[PDB]
Design a protein around this ligand. Structure first.
Ligand SMILES: C[C@]12CCC(=O)C=C1CC[C@@H]1[C@@H]2[C@@H](O)C[C@@]2(C)[C@H]1CC[C@]2(O)C(=O)CO
Length: 342
């Protein structure tokens, strides 16, 4: 069970953060990777107790070494569901001005996490931001092309994750066709809609009015597509917890379905300074300003590697919730509110 030792903490943290973010802006697409955010905060706590406490740990019960060792081990366990998941995750620190990180900190970070520190010598912010942008692109297989544009900091942390998976039940690109997606009450937009028929894990819940489709990736990855009943998005969002997802996971059963899911890439940024407030940058530097951002990017596509029951049609053609998890570590790989895939 040790491979799952951080799940309860990490996943409580993930659902609370997600709910907070959806509340702050309910009308936007939200995409984050909680496990990636947990890693980034844990990593910065190497050089800074209020960071770790904010992640959900009580340090009277778990020592510092225990946490960093658990996170190290988790990072190794995560890079293994990659049989059917392209998952470029990492942390880059960019140091502007004449600033150097402590040798102690830089070493601890390389060791327990896989982070990188780069000196940006351009005073001009346009160049600086571009170099920072070229970095993260290269590290994400050409996929995250911009992070900044935007207020220049002296010390910049980028936590990034590109994710893209191969389905156990892939869609046929031939079947993908333009359909209406209903964004809100007045506006429809056209999106490429993927379509397949088959026996697919499905649940129609009543306490929280939604329908769920569970789509497995090849490997240990899995996706919950959650379609709230009409008018019920706020309710379902409030339902989200480790308690609730445990229930759902146990009630999913194969059912013959006609399944319509949009093909899209989504990306989003999250200011880590609202979970990691009042860091002392001087604790990290050998001896001004601070930008710490998490950028997540999900490519959702057809995902291919190479009965006398009437099927039910379920279309994700209006806003929905997308939760990606690792079945092995119980990690939250991504949580999303998909409001508009066009
Ligand atoms: C709440 C739960 C169990 C207790 C825990 O500390 C953390 C979690 C979060 C992730 C959950 C997990 C289990 O319920 C099994 C789940 C649902 C997993 C995500 C995907 C899962 O592995 C399955 O889909 C199993 O079919």
């Amino acid at each position: 069970n040790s491979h799952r030792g951080l799940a309860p903490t990490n996943v409580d943290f993930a659902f609370n953060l997600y709910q907070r973010l959806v509340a702050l802006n309910p009308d936007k697409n939200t995409l984050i990777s909680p496990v990636s955010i947990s890693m980034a905060l844990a990593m910065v706590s190497l050089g800074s107790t209020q960071s770790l406490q904010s992640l959900g740990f009580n340090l009277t019960e778990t020592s510092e070494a225990e946490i960093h060792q658990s996170f190290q081990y988790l990072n190794y366990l995560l890079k293994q569901s990659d049989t059917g998941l392209e998952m470029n995750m990492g942390n880059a620190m960019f140091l502007l001005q004449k600033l150097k990180l402590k040798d102690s900190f830089l070493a601890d970070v390389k060791q327990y996490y896989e982070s990188e520190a780069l000196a940006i010598d351009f005073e001009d912010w346009t160049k600086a931001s571009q170099q920072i942008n070229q970095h993260v692109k290269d590290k994400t297989q050409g996929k995250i092309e911009h992070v900044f544009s935007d207020s220049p900091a002296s010390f910049i942390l980028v936590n990034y994750i590109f994710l893209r998976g191969i389905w156990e039940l892939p869609f046929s690109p031939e079947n993908t066709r333009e359909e209406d997606f209903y964004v809100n009450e007045t506006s429809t937009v056209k999106v490429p809609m993927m379509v397949q028929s088959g026996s697919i894990g499905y649940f129609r819940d009543s306490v929280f009015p939604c329908q769920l489709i569970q789509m497995d990736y090849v490997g240990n990855g899995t996706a919950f597509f959650i379609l709230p009943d009409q008018g019920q998005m706020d309710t379902v969002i409030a339902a989200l917890s480790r308690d609730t997802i445990d229930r759902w996971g146990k009630l999913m059963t194969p059912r013959q379905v006609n399944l319509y899911i949009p093909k899209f890439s989504m990306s989003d940024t999250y200011d880590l300074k609202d979970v990691l407030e009042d860091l002392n940058i001087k604790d990290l530097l050998t001896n001004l300003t601070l930008t710490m951002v998490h950028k997540a990017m999900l490519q959702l596509d057809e995902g291919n590697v190479l009965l006398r029951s009437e099927p039910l049609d379920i279309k994700f053609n209006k806003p929905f919730i997308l939760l990606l998890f690792d079945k092995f570590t119980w990690s939250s790989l991504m949580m999303s509110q998909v409001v508009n895939p066009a």
